[PDB]
Design a protein around this ligand. Structure first.
Ligand SMILES: CCc1c(C(=O)N[C@H]2c3cc(Cl)ccc3CC[C@@H]2O)[nH]c(C)c1C(C)=O
Ligand SMILES: CCc1c(C(=O)N[C@H]2c3cc(Cl)ccc3CC[C@@H]2O)[nH]c(C)c1C(C)=O
Length: 116
């Protein structure tokens, strides 16, 4: 595959991450790691083996931890798939996840075309 530099990935991908943060209120559950003790859900880490959230993805982009853009896409989908796995289909967090995923699909498609 092609080489990607960290600054190039920030320019291309940060707008797609920003679009998720700007979904308000729907991004609020995703702006920080899940805290199962605080949120009253002690089985969370038994169900969700690889936690992920927007702050972690932002830090990885900011510090240059992605070598290529599909690693970023993988982390976004990990975050979404964790929330659809743990939460019931009628719950607020599940519905907010679906909203963010719709926004992401719209934003990421032209960006990955340009990168690829
Ligand atoms: C239902 C639990 C849950 C939340 C969640 O409730 N987040 C809330 C939160 C959590 C912490 Cl630690 C600190 C602050 C805030 C502010 C509000 C924000 O909605 N987020 C997710 C992805 C889930 C689950 C189980 O997938
Ligand atoms: C959707 C964002 C939001 C939440 C919210 O996500 N609460 C979560 C939470 C957060 C903490 Cl830190 C502690 C406990 C709990 C349990 C419930 C739930 O998991 N509560 C409110 C008032 C809002 C909004 C937008 O007014």
């Amino acid at each position: 595959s092609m080489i990607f530099k960290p600054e190039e990935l920030r320019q291309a991908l940060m707008p797609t991450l920003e679009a998720l943060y700007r979904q308000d209120p729907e991004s609020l559950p995703f702006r920080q790691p899940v805290d199962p003790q605080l949120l009253g859900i002690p089985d969370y880490f038994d169900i969700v083996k690889s936690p992920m959230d927007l702050s972690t993805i932002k830090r990885k982009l900011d510090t240059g931890q992605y070598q290529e853009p599909w690693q970023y896409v993988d982390d976004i989908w990990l975050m979404f798939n964790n929330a659809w796995l743990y939460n019931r289909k009628t719950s607020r967090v599940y519905k907010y996840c679906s909203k963010l995923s719709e926004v992401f699909e719209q934003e990421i498609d032209p960006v990955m075309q340009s990168l690829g």
